[PDB]
Design a protein around this ligand. Sequence first.
Ligand SMILES: CS(=O)(=O)c1cccc(Nc2nccc(Nc3c(Cl)ccc4c3OCO4)n2)c1
Ligand SMILES: [Mg+2]
Ligand SMILES: [Mg+2]
Ligand SMILES: [Mg+2]
Length: 274
Amino acid sequence: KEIDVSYVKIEEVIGAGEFGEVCRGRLKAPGKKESCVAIKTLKGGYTERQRREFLSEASIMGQFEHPNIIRLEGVVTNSMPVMILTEFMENGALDSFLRLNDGQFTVIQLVGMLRGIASGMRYLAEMSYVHRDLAARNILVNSNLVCKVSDFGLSRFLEENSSDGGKIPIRWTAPEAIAFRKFTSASDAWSYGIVMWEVMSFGERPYWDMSNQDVINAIEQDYRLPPPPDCPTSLHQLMLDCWQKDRNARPRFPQVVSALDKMIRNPASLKIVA
Ligand SMILES: CS(=O)(=O)c1cccc(Nc2nccc(Nc3c(Cl)ccc4c3OCO4)n2)c1
Ligand SMILES: [Mg+2]
Ligand SMILES: [Mg+2]
Ligand SMILES: [Mg+2]
């Protein structure tokens, strides 16, 4: 959806993205009430391939409609700067949000966040969309603490292309996906387990100061991240289920959502901690 630039008012720069700024603004179109939007801008000094790469995130987002997937409002392409407009998520990225609020949300709140993420992924998997970069930094959070999946793009990672998407995010990535570049919804399930750990650790870095190769070797040698402080054992076990070496043994997203919904219904089960 092409958005007339006169409909857009940019209010403040709130972030930086790969190709330029991220801003908060307002969108007002004839016949509709004004709404708050995030705006990614792409200014001069870019190649056409880069412009197409930029806008591809819009194309992809525009293919989806789900309350736990960032909603596209439109694009500005017939003037400068080139812009992508989405719904505005007041609390930004989940990892930084949790770090800011370390220890200040209950287990049930955190499980609700995880459920929202899992429902977003359930939807993507149903649509045969493999995310490939599922990580707490790519989950955005609104004023009601609703979590939505962001970061959409289909570019092969640097390792998949010519000898001579960015690099594979090793700490989030399933071992078969690192080794063979086989990215499936089941490798996304591995990543989801990492996101669970991030959330229950209030945004600690997965594997602390281990090197990428240290992480690769540890996982091959049966190491798995331990339960975060005060983490319910049932959640840690769901993480371990997500981190099965055999991708076919991992829960699919409908099962993940089901598991989390049961926890929510039976919050006594979450009292058991190591
Ligand atoms: C807490 S805060 O108000 O300071 C704040 C900081 C950064 C981002 C957001 N909030 C935020 N809300 C929605 C989207 C985005 N970033 C984003 C993505 Cl991830 C992908 C595509 C597009 C985006 O903006 C438009 O096109 N960000 C809010
Ligand atoms: Mg990505
Ligand atoms: Mg990415
Ligand atoms: Mg801590």
